[PDB]
Design a protein around this ligand. Structure first.
Ligand SMILES: [Ca+2]
Length: 75
DNA sequence: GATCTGGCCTGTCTTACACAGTGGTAGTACTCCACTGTCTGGCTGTACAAAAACCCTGCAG
């Protein structure tokens, strides 16, 4: 199998070269994609002409540091 | 005697139409920017009384 081959043959090379792996996890996008699941439910327009547009808007809004910083609010 | 076919019902599906919502927009109406004076009422240094509910005490029973 593939990943097995990667991990028994190719781990050391990349770990040597590009600093760190798992650092570049795809985990983030897929894992977070459940946000695209929920946003469609709650804040839809709704009409697919807009459904994207407003979903993307809310998403990026939820994504910037700035509002996350203001969400922490002194721990 | 034993079976065909319209007349009529209803149980099942289906199809228009209604609400349901949501971010965007327009139309509307209710809150102040700032100027200037100016009146009203609640704070501050002790003194005099007025009410008030319990407590003692006399004296009445
Ligand atoms: Ca995946």
């Amino acid at each position: 199998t593939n990943y097995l081959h990667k991990t028994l043959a190719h781990v050391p090379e990349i770990v040597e070269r590009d600093g760190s792996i798992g650092a570049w996890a795809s985990e983030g996008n897929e894992s977070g994609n459940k946000l695209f699941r929920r946003f469609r439910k709650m804040n839809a327009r709704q009409s697919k002409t807009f459904e994207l547009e407003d979903i993307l808007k809310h998403h990026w809004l939820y994504t910037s540091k700035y509002l996350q910083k203001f969400m922490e609010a002194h721990k």
